[PDB]
Symmetry: C4
Subunit: 377 residues, 4 copies
C-alpha cells in the first residue's frame, strides 16, 4: 500500500536532486546504467559551470569594494552563493556513498518488530517527510520570487539587482541591464534549488534513521518479553544504523560548517542594513531572514532527534524480565547498552556538534554582537 | 497517621489547581466521574477565555508602540501574561498524563526499605512541600497585592495601571477607568494564580521523586546486606521512576522554555526602568524581581536535586559483600549501575537542561548584557 | 620514623585551627575530653563575636555609601571579611564531620601496596604539605603586615585605614583614631588567619586523598600480578575514599561559593582603583591581588589533581594478565572501573565544579569585563 | 622497502632536532654512546645560552616601555621568543622520556593485522608526515626570511629591526647597527627552528599513534572473524598506546599552554598594529599571522584525530559474531570497550584540552575582543 507510495516519494527525492544539476548517481530503480547518460552529464556540467562563474562574478564584485556601507549589502548574496558552490563539489567528491545511502534508505525493514507499530511508523514518516519537503520547497520558491521578480515589476534598463555585481560588460545601458537581469534570474533559480535539495535529502535520512531506532527499541522489548537469532538481527541492525550515520557525517561536514558560518555572517549584515538605514526592500530581507532561520532550525531539530532516540535506545529491555533471563541475554543487552552510550552526533568539520544547544549559543552570541555593535556605536 | 495528612495535602494540590481555572482531570479520590461536571467545565472555559482576551489586549497594546521608553515598561507585564497563556494550553493538551502522574504520586511505596527510613522520609517530604507551597503562595499573593491595590489606594478615575493597556473603550473618562480597573484586578488575580499552581505541582513531583530515589538506594543496600524477588521489585521501581520523569519532561518543556526566555527579558526591562529613570514604583518592581528570582531558583534547585540523587543511586550496593555475592546479583547490580549512569534531566524544549549551572550561566550573561548596555551607553 | 613527624604535622594542623578561633573539636590525640574545655570555648566565642561585630561595622559602612568612587574602595575589605564570617559558621554547623575527617586522615594505611612506594609516598606528601602550608602562611602574614602596619609607620591620629569604616564614635579625633587602629589591627589579624587555616586543612586533605589513590592503584596492579581478600580490602579502601570526598564536598560548598564570588568582585574593584586613579597604595593592592590569585590557583590545582588521579584509577589492572584471570577478578575489576568512571569532583554549592577549566573561564570573563568597562568607558 | 625509508625519515627527525640545539639524547640507531659527545653538548649549550640572552634582552626592552603604541609592536616578537625559551628547558627536563618515545616510534608492529592494510598504512603515514614536515619547514624558513632579510635589502647603519631591542651598546651608530643586525639574524634563525622542530616531532607521534589505532581496530575485527593469544597481544598494544599518550601528555603541557596564550596575545597585537595604523610591513605581519594560524590548526587537527580514532576503537568487533562467541571473548571485548570509553586527550597544563572545539571557542572570543576593542573605541 503506502509502502509503494513511500518508494515513489524517495524516487521523487532523487528526481529533484537530478533536476537541480548535481552529478547523477545510480538510483535504486535504475537497472540499465542510465545514471551515466550523456544528457544528464551535459546538463550537470552546464549548470555547475554557470553557478561557478556567477559566484566568481559576485566574489570579484565583493573584492572590488565600492564602499563599506554597500559592502555588507553585497555579503549576504555572495554568502548564499558560496554555499551552493561548496555543495556542488561535495556531491561530486563522494558520489558513491550517496548510492550507498539511497540503497540503505530503500529497504530498512528491521525484523521482529510488531506490525501495529510498523504501519504507524510508515504513516508518521510519510506525514513528517511530506511536511518538511513541502515547507522548504515553498519557502525557497517564494524566496527566489521576492528576491528576483518584484523590482522588475516596479519598472514594467531593469535595475532590479538587490546588490550590483561585477560583469565584463558595464551593465549600465538599457540592453545590457535586461540581459544580465534574465541571466541572473535563471542563475539564482538554479543556485537556490541546490541547498534546498541537499537539506531535504538530509532531513529524509534523519527521519528514516529516527524511525528505525524506535522500531529497534520495540524489537528489543519484544524479544525480551518472549533466543540467539533475534539478538543477532538486532545487533546487525544497530551496527548498520551506526555505519549509515558515519557515512552521513562523512559527507555533510564541510557543507554544515560553511552553512553555519556564512549564514550567521549574512544575518548580521542583514540586520545591519535593515535596522537603522532606509518599502520594497523590507519584504525581501525579512523573507531571507526567515529562510535562514527556518532552515537552521529544521536542521538542528532533526539532528537532535536522532541523538535523543539513541539515548532512548540506551534504556531498552530494562525490566524485571532482564533479572530472569539467561546470562547470554544479560551480557548482550549490556553490550548493546554500553555501545548505545556513545552519542550518534553530526558535527560540522569537527568544529561543533549541531544540536539545539549550539543553536541557542550561536543565537545568543549573535544577538549580543549585533545589539552591542549597532547600539553603543 | 501523617500518611493520611499527606494524601490530604495532595488533594489540596488538586483543589488549588481546579480553583485556578485549568481544565479539570480525574483526581485519585474521584470515583463518580465528577471531573467532567458542568460547573467545573464552565468555570474553566470562562477563566481561560478571560485570560486569553486580556493577554491579547496587552499584546496589541504592545504592538501599538507608544514610544520606546515606555515599551520596556510594557514588556514585563505582557511577559508574565504570556506565561499564563502557554500554561493553559499545555494542561489541556496533555490532560491524561496528569492523571497518570497523580495516580503515581498517590501510591509510591517501594517495598523492602526499612521503616525507620520510611517514617523520616514522610516527615521530611511533608516539611519541604509545606515550606515550598506556603512560600510561593505568599509571594504570589503579595505580588498581586502590590501590583494592583496600592495605586488605587493613592487615589482613595483610578489611574492605577502600572502600564497602560489597549482597550476598545478609551479608558480615559472617570467611569471607564474604574471598570477597567476592577476588570484588570480580577483578571490579574486569576492569571497570577496559574503558573504558581503549576510550579507547586512540579515541585511536589520533584520532591516525591527525590525521596523515592533515596528509599530505593536504602532498599538496594538492604537487599545486598541480606534473592531474586527483591531485585525484580527494585528494578520495577527504578523503571517506574524513569517513566514518570519522562512524562514530566514531556509536559513541562514548552512552559520552561517560555518561562526562562520571557523572564530574563522582563528582568532586563525591569532593571532598565529601575536603574537610571525616576517612590511608589520601587516596591512593586523589587517585589516582581524577587518573584522572578525565587521562582527560578526553586525550579533549578529541585531540578538539580533529582539528578544528584540519581548519580547517588549509581553508587549503591558497592561494598565488600558485592565481592561475595553470586553472579546473578553481580550482573543485576552492574545493569542497575550502567542504567543509572544516564542522567535523569529535565530540559526546556530540548534547548537547555535546567540545572544550577544553567542558572549561573544565564545570570552571568544577563548581568553582563545589562551592565554594559546601561553603562557604556 | 617520618610517620611520627607526619602525625606531629597533622597535630600542628589542629593546633593552628584552634588558634584561629574556630569551635574546637576532638583531635585524634585527645583522650581526656579536653575539646570541651572552658578556656578554648571562651576564646572561640570571644574571637568570633569580635569578627562578627567588625564585619557588621564594615558592612554598615558600606551601606552608608559615601560616594561611588570610594564604594569600590570599600568592597574588597568587606569582601575578605565576609569570607571569614561564612567560614566561622560552617565550622560550627558541621563540627562532627571534621572529627570524622581527622580520624580518617590520622590512619589511612591501604593494605597490600609495596613498601618502596609507601616510603616515597610519605616523603612526597611531607614535602608538598610543608610547601603549601609555609607558602600560604608567609603570604597571609605579609598580607596583614602590608595592609595594617605601613600607614602607621608613615606617621611615626593614626589615619591608617585603607578605607574608612563605620563606628559609634566618630574616629576623627586623635585618641579615637589610635584606639580604632589597634582594634582593627588585632581584628584583621584574627580574621585573616581563619580562611588561611581552612584552606590549609583542605589542601592537606586533598594531598592525602591523592596519595591514597595512587597507592590504591599500586595495590591493584600488585594483586593482579600475583585471591578474594585483597579485592575486598581494595574495594573497602575505594568506598572509604568516596565517603571521605562526599564529606569534604558537604562541608566546603558554601565557603567555596562565597570565596569565588566575592573574590572576583574584589579583584574587579582592585583593578578599577589601581588602573587609572592615583606610591604607598600600590604595594598593598598588588599583594592583595597576589593573595587572591595564589590561593585560588592552589585550590583549583589540588582540586583537579584528585579527579585526574581518579580517572587514572580507571586504567588500573588493565594488562594481559586480566585476560588470564578468573571470572571473579574479571567481574570485580569491571565493577571497580565502572564505579571509577564517576568523577570525584568538588562543587561550590552545586553552582560550579572547581577545576582548572573553571578558573580559566572565570579569568576570561573577568579579564573581558574589566578591560571593556574600563577602556571603552 | 619503504619501511627502511620511514626509519630514515625518523632518523632525519632526530637529526633536525639535534641541529636546532636541543639537548641531545640517544637515538635508536646509536650503539656507541655518541649522544654524550663533547661537540654536541658544546653546541647545545652555546645555542641555548644565546637564545636565553636574546630573549632576556627583548624582555628588558619590553620592560623599558618606550610608549604604549610601540609596546604592542614589541609584544609579538618577544612572544615568539618566549616560546623558544620554554621549549628548551622542557627538552632538558625530560630527556629520557624522549628516548622512550623514539624507541616506541621505531618499532610499533601490531601483530595479527592483515598485510593489505599494513602496506597502505605505511604509504599513508609516509605521505602525511612528508606533507606536514615540508609545509612547516617551508613556512618557518619564509617567516625568518621575510622577518629579517628584507629591511636590510631596502638599504643595500642597517635599521632593519621590526621593533627595537635593548642592548648594552646603543646600536645607534653605523658599526653597531650592523653588528647587532647580524647577531639578531643568526639568533632568530636558531630560535625559529626550535618550536618548528618540536611541532614536527609531535605531529609525527600523533600520526603514528593514529595509524596504530586503526591497525588495532583491524586486528580486533580480524580476530573476531576467526583464541586467547590474539586478545592478549591486542590488549598489550592498547595499553602501550595509552602509556605512550600519557608520556606525550606529560612532556608537552607547559609548551602548549604558553603557545596558546602568547600566540593569541601576539595575534591581537598584530591585528591592532595592522588594522588602523600605517607597504613593507604588511608582508611580514600577514606571514607571521599565517605562521601562527597554520601551526595552531595543524596541532588541533592532529590532536583531535587521535581522540576520534579512539572513539572509533570503541565500536570494534561489534557484529553478529560477538553473539556467537564464548563468554571469554564476550568479557574481554567488553573490557576493551569500557576502557576505550575514556578519551585519550592532550591538555595544556590541565587548563584546556586541545581540540578543534577549543580552537573555535578561542577564535570566537579573540575575534569578539579584537573587533569590539578596535571598533567602539
Amino acid at each position: 500500500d503506502d509502502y509503494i507510495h513511500l518508494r515513489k516519494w524517495i524516487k521523487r527525492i532523487g528526481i529533484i536532486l537530478r533536476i537541480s544539476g548535481h552529478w547523477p548517481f545510480r538510483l535504486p530503480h535504475e537497472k540499465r546504467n542510465q545514471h551515466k547518460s550523456k544528457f544528464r552529464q551535459v546538463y550537470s556540467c552546464l549548470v555547475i559551470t554557470l553557478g561557478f562563474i556567477t559566484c566568481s562574478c559576485y566574489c570579484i564584485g565583493l573584492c572590488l569594494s565600492e564602499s563599506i556601507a554597500q559592502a555588507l549589502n553585497n555579503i549576504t548574496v555572495t554568502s548564499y552563493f558560496l554555499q551552493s558552490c561548496v555543495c556542488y563539489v561535495s556531491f561530486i567528491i563522494n558520489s558513491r556513498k550517496l548510492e550507498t545511502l539511497f540503497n540503505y534508505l530503500f529497504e530498512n525493514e528491521v525484523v521482529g518488530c510488531p506490525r501495529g507499530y510498523k504501519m504507524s511508523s510508515i504513516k508518521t514518516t510519510l506525514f513528517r517527510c511530506k511536511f518538511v519537503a513541502f515547507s522548504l520547497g515553498i519557502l525557497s520558491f517564494f524566496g527566489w520570487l521576492m528576491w528576483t521578480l518584484l523590482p522588475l515589476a516596479v519598472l514594467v534598463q531593469t535595475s532590479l539587482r538587490f546588490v550590483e555585481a561585477w560583469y565584463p560588460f558595464d551593465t549600465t545601458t538599457s540592453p545590457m541591464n535586461e540581459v544580465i537581469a534574465i541571466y541572473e534570474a535563471v542563475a539564482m533559480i538554479f543556485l537556490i534549488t541546490a541547498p534546498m535539495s541537499s537539506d531535504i535529502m538530509f532531513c529524509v535520512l534523519m527521519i528514516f534513521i529516527v524511525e528505525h531506532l524506535k522500531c529497534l527499541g520495540m524489537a528489543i522489548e519484544c524479544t525480551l518479553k518472549g533466543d540467539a537469532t533475534s539478538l543477532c538481527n538486532i545487533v546487525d541492525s544497530h551496527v548498520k544504523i551506526y555505519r549509515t550515520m558515519e557515512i552521513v557525517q562523512s559527507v555533510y561536514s564541510s557543507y554544515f560548517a560553511t552553512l553555519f558560518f556564512t549564514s550567521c555572517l549574512a544575518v548580521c549584515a542583514l540586520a545591519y542594513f535593515l535596522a537603522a538605514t532606509s518599502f520594497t526592500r523590507v519584504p525581501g530581507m525579512v523573507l531571507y531572514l526567515m529562510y535562514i532561520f527556518l532552515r537552521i532550525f529544521l536542521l538542528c531539530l532533526l539532528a537532535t532527534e536522532v541523538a535523543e532516540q539513541g539515548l532512548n535506545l540506551c534504556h531498552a529491555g530494562y525490566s524485571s524480565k532482564l533479572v530472569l533471563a539467561s546470562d547470554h541475554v544479560r551480557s548482550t543487552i549490556q553490550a548493546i547498552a554500553t555501545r548505545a552510550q556513545i552519542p550518534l552526533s553530526i558535527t560540522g568539520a569537527r568544529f561543533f556538534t549541531v544540536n539545539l544547544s549550539f543553536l541557542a549559543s550561536m543565537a545568543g552570541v549573535m544577538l549580543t554582537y549585533f545589539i552591542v555593535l549597532l547600539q553603543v556605536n
